[PDB]
């Protein structure tokens, strides 16, 4: 729809004047129905006309219309439909809701966003339909089963959350009754999905809640499919819960030990995979509950060969670090020949299992470095360092981890001399994997073992890998920076060779090459100050000062980052591009609509305001404080956090008298993410300089007849109190009649802001003797507890939790008194929640503050221990 071609008339109608060219709609304003979606919403094209023809299915028609409006309608319409379906889920019932939701999600012409919205509606309709979806457990499970095996991680996480919510709502017996015929099914994918759902239900409802059911399913001898499904469910429960199966490791190992002795090789492979998953969890301590599993497994590595032998070798490599030193030495002394014999295996899964077991076979004592370099490392370099291994990510990352383990075990130089030859290849993925392995070897071990005969070859290979890059990945730049950090002072005969290739990369037809050269200059900027190279940095800064005119904003942001790195690595007042001819040069650069370029410009402006504030005539900073108000309202959450620090630095430099009026004039914009970002900047300016100079002016902005300006001033006062803390004892009497008048307003947002300011004043002035103003503010914050808005209720709860620590738990128990036994339950629940919060805040303090209760006829409640006196 968004990529459809448009005619000249539609293009001309969407442009204003002054520019030179160089029935099929259901019942009104319902959204557009697809031609393949005319089956679930077929009852909406005809009119309702509800008069002597309206059964209980007429509410299901409205629920289907709401689902059609939430599926393909407007996002405000989708939010209104979700608010109408969430608040009325109990009245509509789970029956027709499930009967309308289940064929809609099972359509073969669905999409990712519609399935995500259906899963969100099923998750939001599961909290009000608790203990009511037990007949609809299997119908929801048959739709949630392929969601866990999907490609996207977010859809799998949503399916796991929906399965956990269904296990928490339907209990344990209903899921065990529903998942019982789904174990012996003919479909293997449905059996694997049922095993994954059973593992998710066991993770969400506890391991001993489903342990005897899994033990009865695993020990039953009727077919190999039920035992294979039980072993797969045990392996999935071991792989899902990392450290949660450690108290229940023996009860799972005793059930897993019954397998791998049957006539079926698939059940033995599943039992070996479950043992490897259980040993994976108990990677350092699995031997304790594994002595009955080491005897049939190792003979399986001796008596047979194939996929089961590879699974047994993976289980042995997972159980070998979890044993003693002599046991691991005896295991590695008899499995190295089986690993060397499996180096020529044509199978990819056996090669991946061998590469995973080779990382764990050499990680401790017992394996010598000479034998590993003689008989283990040449076949690993000849059989695994190929071009097909770099294609798959799971075959590249495991190979890189095995190479890092071999470099940490044997040595970094012996791996570097064998991996430096692949840095100048013709493949991008193999060169990127070799650069990542070299960066990991330089970060873990270092560059001390590399002599002078290999460092120049490695630098040439890194330069050939960086100069011949076709993708936008940052692996090569990070590897070059890691090599330059590991080299240190050994790169002194390399700076005319590298930087001369950098400036030659600065003039090219492409746009990503200049950005890559600027990123490489920014990553190698810290290696120039430590090698006594100051003329080259001064030449590069003067070169990059004229490189701010690149039309690509992605290259301009990298050039700004390189200039910031050069200004950080060198002195602020000792730069050949000085601050007198750079801070006016960055003033039109700050008006860029990009995210990273404006973030780098704001960081450079904050650094120039913090370290070089004496380089301006105090007039350009006032003109940049008005451009700092347009630096907010950006969806990046980084430039808005640096603009407040830059405004605070400008207020500290030029005085807190001109930026405060600019911050108060920008408080009335009526836009989100622009008045809170100015209130935080005003609070940072009041916290950097003296806050008393910002005390009457913040008292003046509440005098203007505006709700947004008063809310921004109250938010700025609350943020200034939270930033001050213990310095708020002198500014409490000036803010007490403001907070006493803001709490009596009709607007609930001003009352919530006053409650937040009272919470900040109670949390900042605790232990200073300011319990008189806090008790006055609590008398106004106490009628605000009966609000219906969750934000105002959360602000009142935070104010109560801040005032209970300041004024004492006795005053909070006195204010919460005579409300726990209240007749009205709406006040009684809030009083019980406040009493529970006061008990969780200070439980020992409520003993002396407890009221006196008289004794009853049958029971006694008078404390005779504290009533006695000596």
């Amino acid at each position: 729809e968004r990529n459809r071609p448009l005619s000249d008339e539609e293009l001309d109608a969407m442009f204003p004047e002054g520019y030179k060219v160089l029935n099929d709609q259901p019942s009104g304003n319902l959204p557009f129905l697809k031609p393949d979606d005319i089956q679930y919403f077929d009852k909406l094209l005809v009119d309702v006309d509800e008069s002597t023809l309206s059964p209980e299915e007429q509410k299901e028609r409205k629920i289907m219309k709401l689902l059609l409006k939430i599926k393909n309608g407007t996002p405000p319409m989708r939010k209104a439909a979700l608010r109408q379906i969430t608040d009325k889920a109990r009245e509509f019932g789970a029956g027709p809701l499930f009967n309308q939701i289940l064929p809609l999600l099972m359509s073969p012409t669905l999409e990712d966003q519609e399935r995500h919205l259906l899963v969100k509606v099923i998750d939001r309709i599961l909290y009000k339909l608790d203990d009511l979806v037990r007949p609809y457990v299997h119908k929801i499970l048959v739709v949630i089963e392929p969601l866990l095996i999907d490609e996207d991680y977010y859809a799998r996480v949503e399916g796991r959350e929906i399965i956990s919510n269904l296990a928490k709502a339907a209990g344990l017996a209903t899921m065990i009754s529903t998942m019982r015929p789904d174990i012996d099914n003919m479909d293997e994918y449905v059996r694997n999905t049922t095993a994954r759902a059973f593992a998710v239900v066991a993770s969400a409802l506890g391991i001993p809640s489903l342990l005897p059911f899994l033990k009865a399913v695993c020990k039953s001898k009727k077919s190999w499919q039920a035992r294979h499904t039980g072993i797969k469910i045990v392996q999935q429960i071991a792989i899902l819960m990392g450290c949660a199966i450690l108290p229940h490791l023996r009860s799972l190992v005793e059930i897993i030990e019954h397998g791998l002795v049957d006539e079926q090789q698939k059940v033995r492979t599943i039992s070996a995979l479950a043992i490897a998953a259980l040993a994976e969890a108990a990677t350092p301590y699995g031997i304790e509950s594994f002595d009955s599993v080491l005897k049939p497994l190792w003979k399986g590595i001796r008596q047979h060969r194939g996929k089961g032998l590879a699974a047994f070798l993976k289980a042995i490599g997972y159980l070998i670090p979890l044993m003693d030193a002599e046991y691991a030495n005896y295991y590695t002394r008899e499995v190295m020949l089986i690993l060397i014999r499996e180096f020529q295996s044509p199978d990819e899964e056996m090669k991946k299992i061998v590469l995973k077991v080779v990382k764990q076979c050499c990680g401790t004592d017992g394996v010598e470095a000479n034998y590993i370099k003689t008989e283990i490392l040449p076949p690993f370099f000849k059989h695994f360092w190929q071009h097909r291994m770099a294609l798959d990510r799971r075959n590249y990352r495991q190979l890189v981890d095995t190479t890092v383990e071999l470099a940490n075990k044997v040595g970094a130089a012996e791996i570097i001399s064998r991996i430096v030859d692949d840095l100048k290849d013709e493949a991008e993925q193999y060169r990127k994997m070799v650069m990542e392995t070299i960066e990991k070897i330089m970060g873990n071990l270092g560059a001390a073992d590399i002599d002078h005969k290999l460092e120049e070859q490695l630098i040439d290979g890194i330069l050939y890998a960086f100069q011949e890059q076709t993708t936008e990945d940052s692996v090569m730049l990070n590897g070059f920076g890691t090599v330059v950090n590991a080299l240190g002072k050994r790169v002194k005969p390399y700076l005319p060779q590298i930087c001369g290739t950098v400036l030659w990369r600065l003039n090219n037809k492409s746009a990503k090459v200049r950005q890559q050269a600027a990123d490489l200059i920014s990553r190698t900027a810290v290696v120039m100050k430590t090698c006594q190279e100051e003329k080259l940095m001064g030449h590069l800064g003067v070169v990059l000062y004229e490189y701010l005119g690149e039309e690509y904003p992605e290259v301009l942001g990298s050039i700004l980052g390189a200039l910031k790195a050069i200004v950080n690595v060198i002195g602020m007042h000792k730069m050949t591009p000085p601050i007198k001819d750079l801070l006016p040069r960055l003033t039109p650069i700050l008006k860029n609509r990009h995210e990273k370029v404006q973030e780098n410009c704001i960081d450079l402006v904050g650094r120039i305001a913090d370290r070089g504030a004496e380089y301006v005539s105090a007039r350009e900073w006032m003109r940049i404080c008005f451009e700092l108000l347009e630096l907010l309202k950006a969806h990046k959450k980084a430039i808005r956090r640096a603009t407040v620090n830059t405004f605070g630095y400008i207020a500290k430099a030029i005085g807190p008298h001109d930026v405060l009026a600019t911050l108060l004039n920008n408080l009335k914009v009526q836009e989100r993410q622009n008045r809170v970002c100015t209130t935080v900047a005003i609070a940072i300016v009041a916290e950097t300089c003296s806050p008393f100079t910002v005390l009457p002016a913040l008292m003046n902005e509440y005098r203007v007849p505006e709700l947004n300006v008063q809310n921004g001033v109250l938010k700025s006062l609350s943020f200034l109190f939270e930033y001050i803390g213990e310095m708020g004892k002198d500014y409490i009497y000036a803010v007490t009649p403001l907070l006493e008048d803001a709490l009596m307003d009709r607007d609930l947002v001003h009352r919530q802001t006053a409650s937040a300011v009272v919470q900040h004043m109670s949390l900042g002035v605790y232990g200073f003797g300011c319990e008189d103003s806090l008790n006055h503010l609590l008398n106004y914050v106490w009628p605000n507890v009966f609000e219906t808005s969750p934000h105002v209720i959360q602000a009142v709860m935070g104010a109560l939790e801040g005032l209970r620590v300041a004024i004492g738990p006795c005053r909070m128990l006195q204010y919460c008194l005579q409300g726990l036994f209240h007749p009205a339950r709406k006040v009684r629940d809030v009083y019980w929640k406040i009493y529970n919060s006061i008990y969780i805040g200070s439980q020992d303090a409520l003993i002396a503050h407890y009221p006196r209760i008289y004794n009853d006829d049958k029971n006694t409640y008078i404390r005779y221990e504290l009533d006695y006196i000596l």
Binding site: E726, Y766, G767, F768, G769, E771, D772, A806, I807, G808, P809, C810, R811, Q814, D844, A845, I847, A848, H849, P851, R852, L866, D867, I869, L870
Partner: protein
Amino acid sequence: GHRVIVSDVQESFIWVRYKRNENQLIIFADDTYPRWVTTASLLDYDTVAGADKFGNICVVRLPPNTNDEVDEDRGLLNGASQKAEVIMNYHVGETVLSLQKTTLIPGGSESLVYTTLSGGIGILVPFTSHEDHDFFQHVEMHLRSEHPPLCGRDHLSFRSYYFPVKNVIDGDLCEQFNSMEPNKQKNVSEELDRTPPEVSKKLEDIRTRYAF
């Protein structure tokens, strides 16, 4: 003098005025905070210092109006009308069973000596000037951050266990500056812009003038 301070075992201590012409005893002053005080001691004509069985010790100060001319049905909150206020409260850790304002050494000043049930003996002396009190508060705020206790409990949360502290300076944390490392003592003296022998003399002069 012409008044009574009836200390109750559960709520608080209540003031009662006695008349010369009549013989009635009408209570006109009470406290709102529950203390369950065991003993008490009078310091001034308006304020009264008391100690609780839980371990805390407070001082209830009368309002500056102090309307005692009440002849005699609702009060303010199920009690009297003139609710008293507190100006000092501190937790000591032990049940203080004796308190008396006197002078333990001749030539010094008056101070409240207290004897608890754990065998210890404490002394509460007021501040002469605001500069010495501010220096003691700064030394306490520096020692609470630089020298944490071995038990792991916060020093600010120890005196504010039952009742919150107000205008109470803990001298046991201020007297621990001479038993720490010399580098931390030099850093605390540089943060307070003084000398560690000068800080030790300023910490010891008040203890020598107020008590032994």
